[PDB]
From a paper:
The nucleosome core particle serves as the primary structural unit of chromatin and consists of ∼147 base pairs of DNA wrapping around a histone octamer composed of two copies each of histones H2A, H2B, H3, and H4. Among all binding hot spots on the nucleosome disk surface, nucleosome acidic patch emerges as a primary docking platform recognized by wide array of protein complexes, including histone chaperones, chromatin remodelers, and histone ubiquitination ligases. RNF168, a well-known E3 ubiquitin ligase, is recognized for its role in ubiquitinating H2AK13/K15 through a complex with UbcH5c. Additionally, this analytical method was used to study RING-family ubiquitin E3 ligase RNF168, demonstrating that RNF168 dimerization enhances its binding to the nucleosome, a finding confirmed by cryogenic-electron microscopy structural analysis.
Author numbering:
A (entry chain C): 16 to 117
B (entry chain F): 25 to 102
C (entry chain E): 39 to 135
D (entry chain K): 11 to 93
E (entry chain D): 28 to 122
F (entry chain H): 29 to 121
G (entry chain G): 14 to 114
H (entry chain A): 38 to 134
The structure:
DNA sequence: TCGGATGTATATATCTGACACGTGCCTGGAGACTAGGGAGTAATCCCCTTGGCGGTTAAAACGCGGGGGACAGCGCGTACGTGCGTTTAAGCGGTGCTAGAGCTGTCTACGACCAATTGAGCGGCCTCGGCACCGGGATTCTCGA
DNA sequence: CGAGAATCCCGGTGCCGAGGCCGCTCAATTGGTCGTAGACAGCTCTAGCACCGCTTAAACGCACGTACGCGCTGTCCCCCGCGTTTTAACCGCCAAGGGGATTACTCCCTAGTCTCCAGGCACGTGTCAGATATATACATCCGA
């Protein structure tokens, strides 16, 4: 396949179909699916690595929405990227103002 | 109805937010802001459903309405 | 015995920030949503998943607003939140005119 | 010496970098084989990209604890590789 | 029964490659799917906008590269463009 | 080359409403930008609705819902009234 | 009448908006009454803004509308202010306002 | 002789500057600054005077809005003088970084 | 010619006029540095976007269209300079 | 509590350039045809939403007591507004130059459309362990001392 | 420094969601052609950069002195924590039919194509609304 042609894990065929079906442009080049699949794959790898790290720190063997929330809101540029997204069952980070403490 | 949102629930929301001490009028103010927010969201969702020729408001329409309002929500096949 | 005021408050604060379940009870919220939708068009039907999504969104928005009011209140050298704080926070966000 | 030489280029480990998979590599060779090429462990294929990002941000790639031990035990080998 | 498609198997593949000893909940797969779709939408939409803007009717690798550079913040965007250029040169090496 | 603009059209409207008032170049350009802004907003909303509803063409209902979603209450009401009057006129004659 | 604009009794060109929609990749196909609807809405909006611009111009005793008059119009109209709540108008200025304290 | 008390000249100035619309920051210094900032990123860029003017427009609008919010916060704090803490609160509540 | 310390061209009387238009009455002494910093970061972002647009266009001149379109990307649309 | 002076507003002239109009020309708009797919409509099935009723049970509501927090008055000391004198550089305006934006011809490699072929991927069925829940002990704290 | 509960750390059971395997059809692959969007070369003129000088408006620095930020104190009353009583949310369970989803059918609305032509385009030209400078008349704000 084209995925094995470049060593990626994401579907070159699916993303090529979606670019056409979305009516984004009259014609679509060949390197576009490969590039877009690569960037999506790397981003998901980042998210999964951080979520798994947080989950293992919490001492569990599965990722849950709370682990995803910890991972995203704990990292600076990822918080910037998903600054407008609310995660279901995510909760909030433990943070108390210094003066409010006894 | 609108007073169904009770004051221990409002207190729990404030406690989760990090608030330590609350006053008396906070309850009515919070009821007002929540009413406004719900009004807007259900208006948009109902418009979508009316366009779709359906009598059932679906979570996908609510996700679209929240996307319109710039409050994107994950976890419902979005 | 009695704890001094504020310590049980912060204990609850920690307990609730450690949790992840929803706080508003389902039946009153569903009745509220049905009443609101009744004004606009008659005899609508709702998905339970749609009601849950609305609950999620309202939960998050209220939590964020309360964070902002706490910041304004502590800036005002007070420790108690007040309606003027919420009003000013909404104005600065730009929601209220 | 055998434990103190990375298994890829066989030279003595200079500025060793210990990946979270407990493996270790020598530096000019770490960035030659990993940092700019694959972003994965040469033996267990573990992805390391965010690890390297965070460490390059905080300049903690080189294990100091092992580096001091290596310099104390084989300073001549370290100097010969550096030259 | 509608044949809805999903990214679940490939997300699972990436997780297997990165963290071998870990599992996933169906809820979590839902958020991962939504996140992938959202990023795809943003990139495709801005790239289409750019292609319309430069009075050119084809969307290419240069368009998506500029897309990544405008959307993602600095460090990650550098990493993404490196990954993408590696992938495209590897693909065009073979036919 | 040619630089398309809605100048004569805005001038027609302004002459229709206020017979004794002219327009400056800066204001004319501002109005030209505003029309294009609302144009892209409405068109994008209609396209999203059409794609979501699994439909291959946009029409009067699509633009009607787009105007209803975009403009606030009374403006949208008067706009939809104007639109239906105009389309009724066009289809009748 | 030949022209669609005269057919519908509108000032904005149905043919122009038809061409623009066709060259916009908004849909695979486009309808017939859609350009007419869009032109009517656009014309109503321009008429609406010109109402207030002209009234402000008369208030300032001027014969020509300018960006300051446009800014005053937009920011005095409540609804249009919500429509254009995130728009900067060149040379617009700020409404005269002093807060109480 | 004569000296106006503090405040009256301030009100006079604010009404003067709210009546008019001309630009305030000086154009040659602004052009120098923007050219330097550009030189930071990529070498050898030339600029349209219209581009410089547009950048000045946007910067003016943004700073005036920021000062309005800062004044609101300072008034909320029962003060008359604004301070960097007020500026920081304005930016934080807006959600900028 | 090399440019340096141009951020100081933003004079304190100019800062004062901006605040006077904004409605401020009494002005502190430390806010000049803060205003300079916020203006710096805002210009950094808008210039970044405009330069990238021009780079993709394969040109050597930054245009009003590019600046306007960057400001539209940031969600701060501006009227009166085309488009 | 009048009075000076200084800012504002008012009035008037005038000269200029920006706006309005005439005019002529070419690309976009209008009319006519076709044929082909997409939406309209009827019908059918079954799934999900609504409604009712009750049982234990934790949550909500009410009262009360008091102590910590908000708000007002006061006093002190300094930082910023205001005025003036001096210094600096921005603004206006000619001149000169060339580098790069913009337009156009030619040719061509690259992508849309079409037909054949197959296997990755999705709906379904299965099975079993990670963590929800829970009863017993340590601690890590809060409050009185 | 003392007690003393709230919470943290811990061993056991067990059960519902996760992980694995199945198999078939629709989307991916492959091969091929044709045409046009796109790459490359060539020429050419608006404009961005650089300069110089004169002028004058604006920026700096200084002084002064008074209004406001800040810490302190006191007082009164409004939430917080606890104990007790009332209530309806939550779960399980059974009934019912309205409407979402799917399939088939058919007619009509629109992309694509070609032929005509006039409303919209640039270009040239004339003149009156308004910026500027300047002369005048009042509001008012603070010193006396
Ligand atoms: Zn390894």
């Amino acid at each position: 396949t084209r995925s094995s042609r470049a060593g990626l894990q994401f579907p070159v065929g699916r993303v090529h179909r979606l670019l056409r079906k979305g009516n984004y442009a009259e014609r679509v080049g060949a390197g576009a699916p490969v590039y877009l699949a690569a960037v999506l794959e790397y981003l998901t790898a980042e998210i999964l690595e951080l979520a798994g790290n947080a989950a293992r720190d919490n001492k569990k063997t599965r990722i849950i929405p709370r682990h995803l929330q910890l991972a995203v809101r704990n990292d600076e540029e990822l918080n910037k990227l998903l600054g407008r997204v609310t995660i279901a069952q995510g909760g909030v980070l433990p943070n108390i103002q210094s003066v409010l403490l006894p | 109805n609108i007073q169904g949102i009770t004051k221990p629930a409002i207190r729990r929301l404030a406690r989760r937010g990090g608030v330590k001490r609350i006053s008396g009028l906070i309850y009515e103010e919070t009821r007002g802001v929540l009413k406004v927010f719900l009004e807007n969201v259900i208006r948009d969702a109902v418009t979508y459903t009316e366009h779709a020729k359906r009598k059932t408001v679906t979570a996908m329409d609510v996700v679209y309405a929240l996307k319109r309002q710039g409050r994107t929500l994950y976890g419902f096949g979005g | 015995h009695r704890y001094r005021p504020g310590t049980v408050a912060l204990r609850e604060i920690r307990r609730y920030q450690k949790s992840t379940e929803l706080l508003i009870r389902k039946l009153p919220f569903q009745r509220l949503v049905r009443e609101i939708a009744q004004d606009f068009k008659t005899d609508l039907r709702f998905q339970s998943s749609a009601v849950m999504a609305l609950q999620e969104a309202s939960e998050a928005y209220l939590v964020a607003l309360f964070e902002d009011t706490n910041l304004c209140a502590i800036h005002a050298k007070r420790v108690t939140i007040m309606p003027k704080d919420i009003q000013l926070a909404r104005r600065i966000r730009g929601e209220r005119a | 010496l055998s434990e103190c030489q990375c298994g890829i280029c066989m030279e003595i480990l200079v500025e060793p970098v210990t990946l979270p998979c407990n493996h270790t590599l020598c530096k000019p060779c770490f960035q030659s084989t990993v940092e700019k090429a694959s972003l994965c462990c040469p033996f267990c294929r573990r992805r390391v990209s965010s690890w390297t990002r965070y460490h390059t941000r905080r300049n903690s790639l080189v294990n100091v604890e092992l580096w001091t031990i290596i310099q104390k035990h084989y300073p001549r080998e370290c100097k010969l590789r550096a030259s | 029964k509608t044949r809805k498609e999903s990214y679940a198997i490939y997300v699972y593949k990436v997780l297997k490659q990165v963290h071998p000893d870990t599992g996933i909940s169906s809820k979590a797969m839902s958020i991962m799917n939504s996140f992938v779709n959202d990023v795809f939408e943003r990139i495709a939409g801005e790239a289409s906008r750019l292609a319309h803007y430069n009075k050119r009717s084809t969307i290419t690798s240069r368009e998506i590269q500029t897309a990544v550079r405008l959307l993602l913040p600095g460090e990650l965007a550098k990493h993404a463009v490196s990954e993408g250029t590696k992938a495209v040169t590897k693909y065009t090496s073979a036919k």
